[PDB]
Amino acid sequence: SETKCTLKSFTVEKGIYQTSNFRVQPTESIVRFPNITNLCPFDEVFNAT
Amino acid sequence: DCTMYICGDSTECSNLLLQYGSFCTQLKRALTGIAVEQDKNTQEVFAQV
Numbered sequence: 001s002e003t004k005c006t007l008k009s010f011t012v013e014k015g016i017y018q019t020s021n022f023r024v025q026p027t028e029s030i031v032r033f034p035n036i037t038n039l040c041p042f043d044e045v046f047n048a049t
Numbered sequence: 050d051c052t053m054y055i056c057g058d059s060t061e062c063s064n065l066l067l068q069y070g071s072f073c074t075q076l077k078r079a080l081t082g083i084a085v086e087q088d089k090n091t092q093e094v095f096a097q098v
């Protein structure tokens with residue numbers, strides 16, 4: 001039925017008829033990053049005496 | 050693969066690409082014509098026995 005909708009006909013003669021396309025799908029988001037360091041002292045301004 | 054060449058993975062793109070009409074159908078039809086003739090070229094040169 002996908003072939004008949006590609007050809008826009010109801011009779012499909014013999015032969016290979018390139019229907020759709022395919023492609024496995026990703027399944028994650030692994031967003032690696034550089035182990036942070038210089039992590040500011042926001043406390044200086046938020047915890048002054 | 051017209052969709053994978055232009056857009057590439059993205060899916061928000063696919064709805065935008067549909068707005069240009071049948072350009073991707075024309076590319077597949079044109080290239081299939083070449084693909085079928087290249088095997089016939091070989092049969093006509095060698096398959097004469």
Ligand SMILES: *[C@@H]1O[C@H](CO)[C@@H](O[C@@H]2O[C@H](CO)[C@@H](O)[C@H](O)[C@H]2NC(C)=O)[C@H](O)[C@H]1NC(C)=O
Pocket residue numbers: 043047
């Ligand atoms: C705000 O500052 C106070 C002190 O200026 C912090 O309290 C210290 O917390 C550490 C964490 O275990 C203790 O070892 C100290 O004995 C505490 N000192 C005092 C005087 O209480 C507090 O943790 C700071 N809070 C934030 C959110 O920065």
